[PDB]
Design an enzyme around this catalytic site. Sequence first.
Site, mmCIF file in Angstrom:
data_model
loop_
_atom_site.group_PDB
_atom_site.id
_atom_site.type_symbol
_atom_site.label_atom_id
_atom_site.label_comp_id
_atom_site.label_asym_id
_atom_site.label_seq_id
_atom_site.Cartn_x
_atom_site.Cartn_y
_atom_site.Cartn_z
ATOM 1 N N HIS A 1 7.399 5.158 -38.394
ATOM 2 C CA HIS A 1 7.790 4.166 -37.306
ATOM 3 C C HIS A 1 6.886 3.059 -37.671
ATOM 4 O O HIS A 1 5.731 2.945 -38.241
ATOM 5 C CB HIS A 1 7.667 4.544 -35.875
ATOM 6 C CG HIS A 1 8.218 5.795 -35.480
ATOM 7 N ND1 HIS A 1 9.590 5.649 -35.046
ATOM 8 C CD2 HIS A 1 7.959 7.009 -35.504
ATOM 9 C CE1 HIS A 1 10.059 7.056 -34.706
ATOM 10 N NE2 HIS A 1 8.886 7.620 -34.948
ATOM 11 N N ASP B 1 8.380 -4.588 -34.575
ATOM 12 C CA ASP B 1 8.690 -6.005 -34.956
ATOM 13 C C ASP B 1 8.747 -6.666 -33.515
ATOM 14 O O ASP B 1 9.570 -6.327 -32.570
ATOM 15 C CB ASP B 1 10.027 -6.070 -35.761
ATOM 16 C CG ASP B 1 10.733 -7.396 -35.420
ATOM 17 O OD1 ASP B 1 10.229 -8.217 -34.749
ATOM 18 O OD2 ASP B 1 11.777 -7.541 -36.163
ATOM 19 N N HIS C 1 9.587 -10.037 -31.369
ATOM 20 C CA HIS C 1 10.245 -11.163 -31.809
ATOM 21 C C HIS C 1 9.495 -12.304 -31.226
ATOM 22 O O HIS C 1 9.803 -13.578 -31.462
ATOM 23 C CB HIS C 1 11.723 -11.036 -30.822
ATOM 24 C CG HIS C 1 12.674 -10.398 -31.398
ATOM 25 N ND1 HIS C 1 13.972 -10.274 -30.774
ATOM 26 C CD2 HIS C 1 12.925 -9.477 -32.601
ATOM 27 C CE1 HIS C 1 14.710 -9.296 -31.638
ATOM 28 N NE2 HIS C 1 14.272 -8.749 -32.573
ATOM 29 N N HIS D 1 10.798 -4.052 -31.019
ATOM 30 C CA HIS D 1 11.567 -2.989 -31.426
ATOM 31 C C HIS D 1 10.869 -2.216 -32.715
ATOM 32 O O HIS D 1 10.564 -3.126 -33.687
ATOM 33 C CB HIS D 1 13.014 -3.043 -31.374
ATOM 34 C CG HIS D 1 13.425 -4.129 -32.634
ATOM 35 N ND1 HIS D 1 13.447 -3.855 -33.892
ATOM 36 C CD2 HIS D 1 13.654 -5.463 -32.487
ATOM 37 C CE1 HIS D 1 14.199 -4.753 -34.668
ATOM 38 N NE2 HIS D 1 14.016 -5.972 -33.803
ATOM 39 N N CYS D 2 11.106 -0.813 -32.752
ATOM 40 C CA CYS D 2 10.801 -0.456 -34.343
ATOM 41 C C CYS D 2 11.814 -0.899 -35.119
ATOM 42 O O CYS D 2 13.124 -1.336 -34.925
ATOM 43 C CB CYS D 2 10.934 1.166 -33.876
ATOM 44 S SG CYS D 2 10.639 2.075 -35.526
ATOM 45 N N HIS E 1 16.637 3.741 -35.446
ATOM 46 C CA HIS E 1 15.626 3.599 -34.471
ATOM 47 C C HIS E 1 15.555 3.103 -33.169
ATOM 48 O O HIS E 1 15.576 3.214 -31.962
ATOM 49 C CB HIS E 1 14.467 3.345 -35.146
ATOM 50 C CG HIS E 1 13.589 4.269 -36.084
ATOM 51 N ND1 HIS E 1 12.263 4.619 -36.120
ATOM 52 C CD2 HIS E 1 14.076 4.757 -37.276
ATOM 53 C CE1 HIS E 1 12.272 5.545 -36.790
ATOM 54 N NE2 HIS E 1 13.250 5.682 -37.750
ATOM 55 N N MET F 1 14.168 2.826 -29.246
ATOM 56 C CA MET F 1 12.810 2.437 -29.960
ATOM 57 C C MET F 1 12.532 1.064 -29.626
ATOM 58 O O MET F 1 12.535 0.364 -30.714
ATOM 59 C CB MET F 1 12.419 3.186 -30.864
ATOM 60 C CG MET F 1 10.927 2.929 -31.286
ATOM 61 S SD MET F 1 10.649 4.316 -32.510
ATOM 62 C CE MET F 1 8.683 3.940 -32.454
ATOM 63 N N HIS G 1 24.603 -8.999 -13.702
ATOM 64 C CA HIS G 1 25.274 -9.468 -12.619
ATOM 65 C C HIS G 1 24.549 -8.904 -11.281
ATOM 66 O O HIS G 1 24.554 -7.634 -11.567
ATOM 67 C CB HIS G 1 26.607 -9.328 -12.538
ATOM 68 C CG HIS G 1 27.520 -9.950 -11.377
ATOM 69 N ND1 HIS G 1 28.027 -11.114 -11.324
ATOM 70 C CD2 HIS G 1 27.505 -9.529 -10.157
ATOM 71 C CE1 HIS G 1 28.429 -11.262 -10.340
ATOM 72 N NE2 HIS G 1 28.296 -10.361 -9.276
ATOM 73 N N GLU H 1 26.443 -16.472 -11.710
ATOM 74 C CA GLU H 1 27.007 -15.406 -11.169
ATOM 75 C C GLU H 1 26.840 -14.168 -12.013
ATOM 76 O O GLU H 1 26.356 -13.243 -11.788
ATOM 77 C CB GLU H 1 28.758 -15.334 -11.021
ATOM 78 C CG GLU H 1 29.424 -15.502 -12.077
ATOM 79 C CD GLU H 1 31.075 -16.045 -11.751
ATOM 80 O OE1 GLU H 1 31.616 -15.308 -11.091
ATOM 81 O OE2 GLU H 1 31.644 -17.120 -12.031
ATOM 82 N N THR H 2 26.887 -14.619 -13.459
ATOM 83 C CA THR H 2 26.787 -13.533 -14.621
ATOM 84 C C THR H 2 26.414 -14.611 -15.772
ATOM 85 O O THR H 2 26.689 -15.712 -15.782
ATOM 86 C CB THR H 2 28.239 -13.250 -14.692
ATOM 87 O OG1 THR H 2 28.517 -12.335 -13.738
ATOM 88 C CG2 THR H 2 28.061 -11.964 -15.964
ATOM 89 N N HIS I 1 28.452 -6.666 -16.410
ATOM 90 C CA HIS I 1 29.591 -6.917 -15.617
ATOM 91 C C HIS I 1 30.873 -6.759 -16.652
ATOM 92 O O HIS I 1 31.856 -7.320 -16.523
ATOM 93 C CB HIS I 1 29.722 -8.345 -15.026
ATOM 94 C CG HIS I 1 30.638 -8.323 -13.793
ATOM 95 N ND1 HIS I 1 31.977 -8.066 -14.176
ATOM 96 C CD2 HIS I 1 30.600 -8.233 -12.612
ATOM 97 C CE1 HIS I 1 32.684 -8.492 -12.845
ATOM 98 N NE2 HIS I 1 31.621 -8.490 -11.724
HETATM 99 O O1 LIG Z 1 14.596 -9.096 -36.016
HETATM 100 N N1 LIG Z 1 15.409 -8.235 -36.231
HETATM 101 O O2 LIG Z 1 15.438 -7.055 -35.904
HETATM 102 O O1 LIG Z 2 30.213 -7.874 -9.090
HETATM 103 N N1 LIG Z 2 30.098 -6.846 -9.688
HETATM 104 O O2 LIG Z 2 31.554 -6.445 -9.960
HETATM 105 CU CU LIG Z 3 10.768 4.208 -34.832
HETATM 106 CU CU LIG Z 4 14.963 -7.605 -34.161
HETATM 107 CU CU LIG Z 5 32.076 -8.538 -10.060
#
Ligand SMILES: O=N[O-]
Ligand SMILES: O=N[O-]
Ligand SMILES: [Cu+2]
Ligand SMILES: [Cu+2]
Ligand SMILES: [Cu+2]
EC number: 1.7.2.1
Lengths: 333, 333, 333
Positions: free
Chosen positions: A88, A91, A93, A128-129, A138, A143, A248, A272-273, A299
């Site tokens: 493992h 990374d 970001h 993340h791995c 992974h 992960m 949402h 809303e979303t 949603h």
């Molecule tokens: O950042 N690339 O998994």
């Molecule tokens: O707002 N959820 O359907």
């Molecule tokens: Cu891993």
């Molecule tokens: Cu990434």
């Molecule tokens: Cu909704």
Amino acid sequence: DISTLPRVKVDLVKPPFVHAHDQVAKTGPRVVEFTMTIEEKKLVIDREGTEIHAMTFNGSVPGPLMVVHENDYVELRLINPDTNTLLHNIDFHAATGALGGGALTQVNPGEETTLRFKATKPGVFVYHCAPEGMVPWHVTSGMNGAIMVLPRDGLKDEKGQPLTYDKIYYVGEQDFYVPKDEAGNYKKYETPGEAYEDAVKAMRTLTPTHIVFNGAVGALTGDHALTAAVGERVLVVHSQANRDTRPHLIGGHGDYVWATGKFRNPPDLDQETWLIPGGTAGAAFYTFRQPGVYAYVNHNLIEAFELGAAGHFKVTGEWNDDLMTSVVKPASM
Amino acid sequence: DISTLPRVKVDLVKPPFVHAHDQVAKTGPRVVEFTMTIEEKKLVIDREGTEIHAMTFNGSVPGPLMVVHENDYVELRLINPDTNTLLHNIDFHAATGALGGGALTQVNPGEETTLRFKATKPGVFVYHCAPEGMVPWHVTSGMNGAIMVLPRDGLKDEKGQPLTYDKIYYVGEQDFYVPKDEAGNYKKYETPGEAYEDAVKAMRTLTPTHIVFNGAVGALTGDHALTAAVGERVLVVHSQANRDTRPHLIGGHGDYVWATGKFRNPPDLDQETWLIPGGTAGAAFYTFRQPGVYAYVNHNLIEAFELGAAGHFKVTGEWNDDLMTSVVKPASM
Amino acid sequence: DISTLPRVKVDLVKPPFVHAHDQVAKTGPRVVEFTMTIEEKKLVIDREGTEIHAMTFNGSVPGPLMVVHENDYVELRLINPDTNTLLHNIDFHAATGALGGGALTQVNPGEETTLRFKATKPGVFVYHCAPEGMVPWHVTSGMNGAIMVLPRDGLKDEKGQPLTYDKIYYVGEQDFYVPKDEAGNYKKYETPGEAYEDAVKAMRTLTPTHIVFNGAVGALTGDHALTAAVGERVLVVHSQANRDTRPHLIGGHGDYVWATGKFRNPPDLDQETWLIPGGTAGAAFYTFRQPGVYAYVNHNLIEAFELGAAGHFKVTGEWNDDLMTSVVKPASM
Ligand SMILES: O=N[O-]
Ligand SMILES: O=N[O-]
Ligand SMILES: [Cu+2]
Ligand SMILES: [Cu+2]
Ligand SMILES: [Cu+2]
Ligand SMILES: O=N[O-]
Ligand SMILES: [Cu+2]
Ligand SMILES: [Cu+2]
Ligand SMILES: [Cu+2]
């Protein structure tokens, strides 16, 4: 000179909770020390009892939320115990160089490593791995987690005024690809190596079998519902390391939303979303105005209510009939 | 009167390179003359040798990046040689009227046409073929590219200050739908007409078989990796004519990102990953700060690492241990 | 005291038209009274004659667009006639509390209810049915619409200047999941209860069989094409209650776009295409500059041209050769 800086040791907590931190930095830049232990483990992910071989940071899906401030140094000790079977790495970001740390953190079972990076950009970010040649396996085995890098003067609204949360939760959303036979039933496997080709085949369908919050269908419900009170300001950090999501709050809003998670940008208001792209963390700020049960979903409501991407808030306080009321309750006439 | 304007002839280059241009306009408005020749050709798109009948502008998938300034006139001579078998046309998302030009540019094999439009809005924009009744077939056969319309005073940041790139690349991302038999193997076909119904059936699954940069798995790797030096400012233009993508520089960021590609809007800052909708071009500006290998991916990592949507940068220069370092290299203890 | 406010009764119209309203509020806050009647009905959704059991508000897919101003009260009388067979309810994404109203509006056949809420946030918002345990089934059977909450001083551009539309249309985009047998043909069913498990199975594929505007393939074409004149300012409200969409005006732009639909945010300028997340309404403002036929699509062009997500504008007026012209019409040479 980094050796002249304060060091502070963080003790992580299990999602959806978040370790103690200060919104506004109460010190100068620090080296913030984290330790995570990789754990390969069996996890039951649905109500039917479907059991997968999860790959976790610190025992959980998602991994824990790490919190620092802009221009702190993150120093992570990553432990891969010899009870695990796979290689493992990690990374971030949030980080710059060496594939976000993945090129410098490759740990076989029975090894550990310590990575340091400067958190130069404020925001929530996926970690993340990502082992060369086996990256989506992974990540889609669970992960992945997130790190929040707060601005040193805390969060600000679209006009530059402070936004201060009372509570913070971390929702990690996980797409799983459990291999299926021709009839549609899930397969199990004797070894990761015997599972790998079928995992690749399942992933190449692009169609998740499950999409869950905090590692399982129903994880953020019942005795583990999220909570708040009327008038509380709540930041929900939400990550998805591999696929788009569209969060949402059913019965609420995102009052201020950083859909792609980076705090130097003004937030979107009154959402809303919103769309958090795969490979991103986002963050929504809301002030609760009504008590009762809320659902918090992806949603795509199939993804929510059939595949698992739904949790709940239980909110205490008084009901506001100005904001909403039943004028005439359901009746026959 | 357009006849009193300067004319300038552009000679295109193959992606991911971009023809010579000035960021800040060094002349008044011009008629900028382009020529593209349609080429239907067989292309090998993966490491297994899978061969498709591609439909290209100028021989490449994507088609070449065209660059003009706001309120220039684009004048395109489009040639469909009689060695091709199909009718083709062109729709510029940059243009106004007649389906973006598609209604005015229908060319049978052995015909040519010349379209002119005014580039009234600054941004990166998709162009693509779109013959009535066969639109997604042409687009998903690779018949799409992009055009950049720079503001006459060049790019600006979220505060109105100049952003000037040192290097520009164009990444075209292509979703292919290679028809499969019941067992999952790719079919081949004797004529486009004999292929058409199976192409329609494959598309209607909505599930790409391949998702590639610059026309093939691994195209932007090895001897064709993208390059930069530490401290160089790099604009990556990225298009996807038919499906959403979520670009990510592994080990970097989008320092300034126009996710939906239109330069009159302030860019999003410090992005990890961003959402370019299907039917859109986007553009990310980054200043490299670390040497070494980077991957540039669609951050659906299945799409990246199993289906082809991954390229590399090779970056020269010195390593910055302040930004990242291994404190303790992987070891057993 | 809400009893001292003016009451105004709205009479809805069928999409894509929109009931009469004022952009700028000509009164103080009001209680705006709406009535909708739920209708379960058979609908033919494609050119092949595929017939589904639709679940509608007011007889249409989508349900009608409701329009109010910020800090009006929406008072909806919702009627479920005893000619229907199912329980239904309504959740307004515009509203605060009780799952957006869904917890307070559960109506069996032969019942009605009246809900009131305060429209505290300006924007376009989805409304949809959401009965506990059967939510995606109702939504993906067509039981969703939208509500626009205008700012009391109307719409504003990115600089605070008025944006006033001459015409408004509402495009509801519907993903259907018509169950298929092993051979790929659509099944029909004797009762909703006998259909339910197969509807769940079809939804869990995540792959729509149809994606349509205004309830059917071709609904916004021919004698039902949208119309405008050169120089008219047109607001297109677009909702998708369950899946992402990427709207595009073929031959035009979104001059000002609220992709996630909330008017306190500055619009995005000059968009080619934009991402409306599933569970969201968005709105695009455009001033037509050229006559002729336009297509308005989801720019996954498979979704557009194979699965139904395409409509047309017919635009009257004079052609502008400065903006676009054929210099040399298609010919052989
Ligand atoms: O950042 N690339 O998994
Ligand atoms: O707002 N959820 O359907
Ligand atoms: Cu891993
Ligand atoms: Cu990434
Ligand atoms: Cu909704
Ligand atoms: O612009 N429609 O392909
Ligand atoms: Cu073509
Ligand atoms: Cu297009
Ligand atoms: Cu219903």
